[PDB]
Design a protein around this ligand. Structure first.
Ligand SMILES: O=C(O)c1ccccc1O
Ligand SMILES: O=C(O)c1ccccc1O
Ligand SMILES: [Zn+2]
Ligand SMILES: [Zn+2]
Lengths: 351, 352
């Protein structure tokens, strides 16, 4: 039996006044027959995508800025203003649907203190449930500076996430600059879900792990989409290499390295979602490694179709239950894991 | 239920006269307690690594140049000379152990025709079994030029692979240039097996797929190590995206795109090895998608330890057999898949 009240939390929007920027994303990610729907959905949080969510048994949608969003704005002052405008916009949109909509903060990640202050404003003044940031922050007068969040200056930001007790969703973004030119110009259809997205996110979150972010902040919560961005299939190989090479080599140099086994972080600090990965077999493999309580349903609208993602979870209920360990596990992944993680009250169809 | 006669084919060496270059690789990939063993193995194809292979039930080792090898030599003329010297060296070393050693060609990949000629020389004159190339060929200052083999000029090379009927093993290599600086300087321990290696190989082989290489050369054979370099866990997502976005978008523009589903290529053109991935659970997942006949045992010596890789496969024989679908599947992965793919005749312990 399928369920209603599902929680979906990798659902993107853009500011309506930047509709022209969304045509550029459409040329990277949207087939011609899907263009009309994409443009309507990405610019209207309360439009047809809400009607489809109601029809297909979603109880609570958490909205976030699309990609790269602020992470593609290389001038700090403009970036900070854009992020604020995104947060004020989506706060106004979700205001009329409090029983079935929430939001993640959009952030400028040029400066850790400023990002901490905007996250605090979103959570404590606007009721947002976390942050969603599109991989590395690009910067400089030519856009080549790549700002990663696994370096020590970001500790003030991680402390803010822990103080607010909200998660950080690390979302992918397309290649930029020389990386785009050198490695993707001759294979442009690999920009996005086929490989480039997960290549970047996996690099970044493994960076957080090996640079000790979760050792310094054991209560930090991070979310990865797409069933973990290539990492679960490599759980054995990565941990093996850390044991065989990386940990003793770093120790011999006095270099910082992760204190715990790889799977510790994926069983304590990291949650996965099913965004764009409507795969019962891949879901099963992930459940077997991280536990059914650590995986959250999500669609990845508007790049994926709500009816398709919900159709997978709903229409294959019996097979998915068998794969993930029974009825409670199935309802946990669909709804109750996220209900507990985000401390959601009663919401639309939640019981 | 363990077996002897296993075939292992991601086994690297370096030219003895470049022993000093192996110090740089040791600083990236080798823990201090393993340095003495690494240096002995990487420079001695017939040394202790052969004694370990005999002890641990390997029947046939296919040697290849380590990484980046020629792919890091940015000057074409020097690169071509180095690749030739590698091939002549290893041909001489394996000559004294023909029942249990073979080799893959090292190639300069600056020029498709020149690489085709050196592969032909290795196969037809030296008896080599295929080519092993460490991802993109670097050129230019600091290696900033990335030469990919999924562009149309490379069809002359793929036609040669098909003419010779030998496989192409696409192995990883470290980051170079601005990519190394921008994306790895603050997380240097992720260079290598933790993520950077598979990030590059998966991009490159998916590039071959989406640029139609296997549609134009349906008989081409490609090998990937490390149980497929992140791709199997994403089989569903990649094919879904090709159906939902990439294929109709490319078709609307008249752009080349893969004609068949992703799994067709992984069931017809591509084989996986277990190099550096002694994981029964990951092996099971791969078998369930591509078939036990398309996965080959391998160790990835000297970066991995022969006793460890063979120990996994041998000591867990019963559990692995159950995971991969029985005794024939287990012996296929250990030995007989590679025996048939490389047309190996009788070899050491080959009927064990
Ligand atoms: O994960 C996303 O939001 C995304 C963004 C662009 C294209 C495809 C996608 O899945
Ligand atoms: O797989 C390899 O041969 C390899 C090459 C360079 C570094 C680490 C490695 O495992
Ligand atoms: Zn998304
Ligand atoms: Zn190797």
């Amino acid at each position: 039996g399928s369920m209603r009240g599902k929680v979906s939390l990798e659902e993107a929007f853009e500011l309506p006044k930047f509709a022209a920027q969304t045509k550029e994303k459409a040329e990277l990610y949207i087939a011609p027959n899907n263009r009309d729907r994409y443009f309507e959905e990405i610019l209207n949080p309360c439009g047809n995508r809400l009607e489809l969510s109601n029809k297909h048994g979603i109880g609570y949608t958490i909205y976030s800025i699309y990609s790269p969003g602020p992470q593609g704005w290389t001038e700090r002052a403009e970036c900070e203003e854009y992020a604020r405008e995104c947060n004020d916009y989506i706060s106004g949109e979700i205001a009329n649907h409090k029983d079935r909509m929430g939001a993640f903060a959009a952030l400028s990640m040029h400066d850790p203190k400023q990002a901490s202050e905007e996250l605090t404003r979103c959570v404590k003044e606007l009721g947002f449930l976390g942050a969603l940031v599109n991989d590395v922050q690009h910067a400089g007068p030519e856009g080549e500076t790549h700002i990663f969040y696994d370096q020590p200056e970001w500790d003030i930001f991680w402390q803010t996430c822990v103080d607010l007790d909200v998660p950080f969703y690390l979302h992918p973004e397309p290649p930029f600059g020389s990386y785009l030119r050198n490695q993707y110009e001759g294979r442009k259809y690999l920009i996005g879900p086929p490989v480039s997205f997960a290549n970047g996110v996996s690099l970044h979150v493994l960076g957080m792990i090996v640079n000790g972010v979760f050792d310094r902040f054991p209560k930090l919560k991070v979310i990865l989409g797409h069933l973990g961005e290539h990492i679960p299939g490599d759980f054995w190989r990565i941990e093996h290499w850390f044991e065989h090479c990386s940990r003793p080599l770093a120790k011999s140099r006095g270099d910082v390295f992760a204190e715990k086994p790889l799977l510790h972080y994926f069983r304590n600090n990291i949650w996965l979602t099913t965004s764009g990965n409507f795969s019962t077999e891949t879901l099963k493999f992930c459940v077997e490694h991280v536990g059914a309580e650590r995986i959250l349903f999500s669609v990845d609208s508007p790049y994926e179709h709500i009816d398709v993602g919900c159709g997978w979870y709903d229409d294959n209920a019996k097979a998915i239950m068998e794969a993930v360990g029974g009825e409670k596990a199935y309802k946990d992944i669909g709804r109750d894991n996220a209900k507990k993680l985000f401390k959601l009250g009663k919401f639309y169809d939640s019981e």
